């Protein structure tokens, strides 16, 4: 699962 921004 890509992390597009920060880990959420």
């Amino acid at each position: 699962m890509p992390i597009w921004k920060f880990p959420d």
Partner: antibody
Framework: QVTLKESGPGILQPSQTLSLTCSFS??????????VSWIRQPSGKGLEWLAH???????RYNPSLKSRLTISKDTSRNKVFLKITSVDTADTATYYC?????????????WGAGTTVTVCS | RDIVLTQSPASLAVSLGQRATISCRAS??????????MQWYQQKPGQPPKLLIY???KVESGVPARFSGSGSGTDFSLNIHPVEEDDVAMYFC?????????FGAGTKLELK
């Protein structure tokens, strides 16, 4: 290759605004998943993250410094900017910018060499 | 609140050919759904920091096989063996689990 270069005023009197510029080449900050952080190493201390700006102009700040910081970008000139208001001796540091590209992990893959700013006494 | 990274030693004087180990302890877990958001960087004077290790144990391209990363949860270590002249540098850890991003305070690796 990908290069990042920080530039600044070199010296700055206290209470003035610090304006830093990260000039980059080899990629576009408009590409989906790109982002750039500003980081600093104060004199005699460890590194400290300041702010990060994503390809879609989403901005994140260090909560301890948020009220003093403004990150921004101009992708037409391949530049990222940082403004720090009301500087004092605690802002004397080498300032770095670094890129992060979307992945399943989260890491800076390329850094600049840094620019040193001295806040005058 | 913030994840504090405690990196030791501050200074490492090593003999050429020996093993050097650098330690990072986090104030809380840096794990995130099957990945560990802990990085190691090398920095030479006047040069950009270079990524060595990401996700605790993955080696970045162009990094010598003398470098390895290990650890889980809160305890991480960087291992250099054998130490060579090119390894004289500043090293630091970095976590990406929570904002603000935070860094270890650094290890200066010098030769005796």
């Amino acid at each position: 290759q990908v290069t990042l270069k920080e530039s600044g005023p070199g010296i700055l009197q206290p209470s003035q605004t610090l304006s830093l510029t990260c000039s980059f080449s080899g990629f576009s900050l408009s590409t989906s998943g790109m982002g750039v952080s500003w980081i600093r190493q104060p004199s005699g201390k460890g590194l400290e993250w300041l702010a990060h700006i994503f390809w879609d102009d989403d901005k994140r700040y260090n909560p301890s410094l948020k009220s003093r910081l403004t990150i921004s970008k101009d992708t037409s000139r391949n530049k990222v900017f940082l403004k720090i208001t009301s500087v004092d001796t605690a802002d004397t540091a080498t300032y770095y910018c670094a890129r992060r590209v979307v992945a399943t992990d989260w890491y800076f893959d390329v850094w600049g060499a840094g620019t040193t700013v001295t806040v005058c006494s | 609140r913030d994840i504090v990274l405690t990196q030791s030693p501050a200074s490492l004087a090593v003999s050429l050919g020996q093993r050097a180990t650098i330690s990072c302890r986090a104030s809380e877990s840096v794990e995130y759904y099957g990945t560990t958001l802990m990085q190691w960087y090398q920095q030479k004077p006047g040069q950009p920091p270079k990524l060595l290790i990401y996700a605790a144990s993955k080696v970045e391209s162009g990094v010598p096989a003398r470098f390895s990363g290990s650890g889980s949860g809160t305890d991480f270590s960087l291992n250099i063996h054998p130490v060579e002249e090119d390894d004289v540098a500043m090293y630091f850890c970095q976590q990406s689990r929570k904002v603000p991003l935070t860094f270890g305070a650094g290890t200066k690796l010098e030769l005796k």
